[PDB]
Amino acid sequence: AGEIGFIIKEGDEVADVTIFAETKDALESELAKYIELAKSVCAGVEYNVSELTEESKELTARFKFEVSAEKLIFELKTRSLARLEHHHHHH
């Protein structure tokens, strides 16, 4: 990996989710639920997001936690959350 144009990069307690959808609005709606899950695991979570525009049909938001355990927990929980693909034009 090289140097990328992000604030927070990869880490030991940093986990990013990459969401795809027609609109940023849809991405934000889902992302907000990830942020919601994040605050449920770690209120002191710090997160960044890719450049948000009208043409961002994809975004990468990384939540860094206090310990690497919280990362794993978030990854474990998102497994049961990010199943049942929901891109079906209804979303």
Side-chain angles (χ1 to χ4, degrees), residues 2-17 44-50 60-66 71:
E3 190 53 86
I4 320 291
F6 288 100
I7 305 175
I8 298 176
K9 300 167 62 178
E10 268 292 329
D12 310 90
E13 23 56 84
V14 187
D16 58 77
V17 190
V45 63
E46 295 180 69
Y47 50 89
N48 298 149
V49 188
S50 310
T60 308
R62 45 185 47 132
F63 306 89
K64 68 161 255 54
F65 299 94
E66 296 295 71
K71 190 180 64 70

Side-chain angles (χ1 to χ4, degrees), residues 15-85:
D16 58 77
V17 190
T18 310
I19 317 173
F20 308 90
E22 282 57 42
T23 51
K24 182 176 63 71
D25 179 275
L27 297 174
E28 289 177 271
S29 302
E30 284 185 53
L31 195 69
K33 281 298 166 182
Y34 288 106
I35 303 176
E36 186 182 275
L37 216 174
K39 288 171 172 286
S40 183
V41 181
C42 190
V45 63
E46 295 180 69
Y47 50 89
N48 298 149
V49 188
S50 310
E51 54 270 73
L52 296 178
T53 52
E54 277 66 74
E55 273 305 306
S56 40
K57 293 77 64 185
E58 175 202 297
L59 80 176
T60 308
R62 45 185 47 132
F63 306 89
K64 68 161 255 54
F65 299 94
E66 296 295 71
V67 298
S68 300
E70 297 179 308
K71 190 180 64 70
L72 298 177
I73 297 175
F74 186 77
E75 293 177 272
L76 285 176
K77 290 186 176 300
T78 44
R79 284 294 168 185
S80 301
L81 158 68
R83 282 192 301 125
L84 307 176
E85 315 86 278

